[PDB]
Design an enzyme around this catalytic site. Structure first.
Site, PDB file in Angstrom:
ATOM      1  N   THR A   1      14.764-157.159 -83.653  1.00 50.03           N
ATOM      2  CA  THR A   1      13.939-156.907 -84.910  1.00 50.03           C
ATOM      3  C   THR A   1      13.138-155.555 -84.987  1.00 50.03           C
ATOM      4  O   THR A   1      12.941-154.747 -85.641  1.00 50.03           O
ATOM      5  CB  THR A   1      13.695-158.311 -85.558  1.00 50.03           C
ATOM      6  OG1 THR A   1      15.798-158.605 -85.735  1.00 50.03           O
ATOM      7  CG2 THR A   1      13.313-158.433 -87.427  1.00 50.03           C
TER       8      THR A   1
ATOM      9  N   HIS B   1      17.862-158.094 -91.384  1.00 51.94           N
ATOM     10  CA  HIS B   1      18.702-157.658 -89.922  1.00 51.94           C
ATOM     11  C   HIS B   1      20.686-158.681 -89.082  1.00 51.94           C
ATOM     12  O   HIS B   1      20.132-159.301 -88.846  1.00 51.94           O
ATOM     13  CB  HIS B   1      17.708-157.419 -88.369  1.00 51.94           C
ATOM     14  CG  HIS B   1      17.852-156.925 -87.849  1.00 51.94           C
ATOM     15  ND1 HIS B   1      17.500-157.307 -86.544  1.00 51.94           N
ATOM     16  CD2 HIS B   1      18.765-156.020 -87.142  1.00 51.94           C
ATOM     17  CE1 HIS B   1      18.180-156.095 -85.300  1.00 51.94           C
ATOM     18  NE2 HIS B   1      19.029-155.365 -85.968  1.00 51.94           N
TER      19      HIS B   1
ATOM     20  N   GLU C   1       9.570-147.781 -89.626  1.00 50.53           N
ATOM     21  CA  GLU C   1       7.867-147.591 -89.604  1.00 50.53           C
ATOM     22  C   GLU C   1       8.271-146.160 -89.262  1.00 50.53           C
ATOM     23  O   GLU C   1       6.958-144.477 -90.254  1.00 50.53           O
ATOM     24  CB  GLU C   1       7.264-147.820 -89.451  1.00 50.53           C
ATOM     25  CG  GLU C   1       6.765-149.396 -89.699  1.00 50.53           C
ATOM     26  CD  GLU C   1       5.816-150.111 -89.653  1.00 50.53           C
ATOM     27  OE1 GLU C   1       4.653-149.326 -89.357  1.00 50.53           O
ATOM     28  OE2 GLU C   1       5.762-151.043 -88.684  1.00 50.53           O
TER      29      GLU C   1
END
Ligand SMILES: CC(C)(CO)[C@@H](O)C(=O)NCCC(=O)NCCCC(=O)CF
Lengths: 133, 133
Positions: free
Chosen positions: B38, B72, B46
């Site tokens: 994750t 996730h 990002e």
């Protein structure tokens, strides 16, 4: 496992947990400030929840993170200790939801919720194996 | 930049982006399934927004992630290509929000939102160094 049960984790931030290090393959990240990466703070918060749940798991049970929702509101250079607190907020049989927060001794650095789901490892690892090239 | 604009990038997951690799130092992670972490998914999203943003910054300007809120829900073994899309949702002064989204060519693996703040690097860096031990 009891709702409202808490675990804290302390972790001194080394040079190799900064933004450059999450993806050493990124030219784009390579001149970022030497501060504790969000993805690493995510990892540290998950880890705390993995540790708190551990002694509640049956042999051959594991768990995966299914969600992360947090702010990251101050920066932390290497050398400060990040303290992460996990508090369990709900359990659904298979599904746990933690309130996580972290500070670095100087500032509160981030807040929120992490969620995980208890799995059967052998038959999780079968199903991942069937999408492995 | 324009609200609604999407930027996409792809990433073949190598063996070294699995859970055990996010924290090599963690004995509790050391035997986790060999799937994409994750915290590495977070980082890759990002990275999508940093790339998109980059044409619009002045020199000496950067950004930092200030919130991430993502699920996730499918695990990814190395070998698969993770495609991440970032769509700009808003800009308010030095603050930007993105919709982020990931799939591994087989499953949708995660999505949600990500917020960043544009920073002046020299200034930020000098403040950061001042909480450094
Ligand atoms: C598989 C999956 O979906 N999540 C597990 C990896 C999450 C992790 O430990 C990195 F922060």
């Amino acid at each position: 496992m009891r709702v409202g049960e808490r675990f804290t984790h302390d972790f001194v931030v080394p040079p190799h947990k900064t933004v450059r290090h999450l993806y050493p393959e990124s030219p784009e990240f390579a001149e970022f400030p030497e501060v504790f990466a969000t993805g690493f703070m995510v990892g540290l918060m998950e880890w705390a929840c993995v540790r708190a749940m551990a002694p509640y798991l049956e042999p051959g049970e594991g768990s995966l993170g299914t969600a992360i929702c947090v702010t990251h509101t101050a920066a932390t250079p290497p050398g400060l200790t990040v303290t992460v607190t996990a508090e369990l907020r709900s359990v659904e049989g298979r599904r746990l939801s933690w309130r996580v927060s972290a500070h670095d001794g100087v500032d509160e650095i981030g807040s929120g919720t992490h969620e995980r789901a208890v799995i059967h490892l052998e038959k999780f690892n079968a199903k991942v194996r069937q999408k492995t090239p």
